[PDB]
Design brief:
RNA-binding protein; globular; about 70 residues; monomeric; Vigilin; ribonucleoprotein
């Protein structure tokens, strides 16, 4: 049942809405640039955690990239 790598980045401030602008585009910028599966969960349970899953270095790279540079 699936065999990909995943990982979430801890977030707080309104990074989601800011990352997905009004509708959402940045999500594609990475997912397409790093060939990964980045997703912005529209929730706020104490601590936010953006979903990031792929396979190659693109997932671990784009993961550390967003958490660090965050575009």
């Amino acid at each position: 049942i699936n065999r990909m790598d995943y990982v979430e980045i801890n977030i707080d401030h309104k990074f989601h809405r800011h990352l997905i602008g009004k509708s959402g585009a940045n999500i594609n910028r990475i997912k397409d640039q790093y060939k990964v599966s980045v997703r912005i969960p529209p929730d706020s349970e104490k601590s936010n955690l953006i979903r990031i899953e792929g396979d190659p270095q693109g997932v671990q790279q784009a993961k550390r990239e967003l958490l660090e540079l965050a575009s």
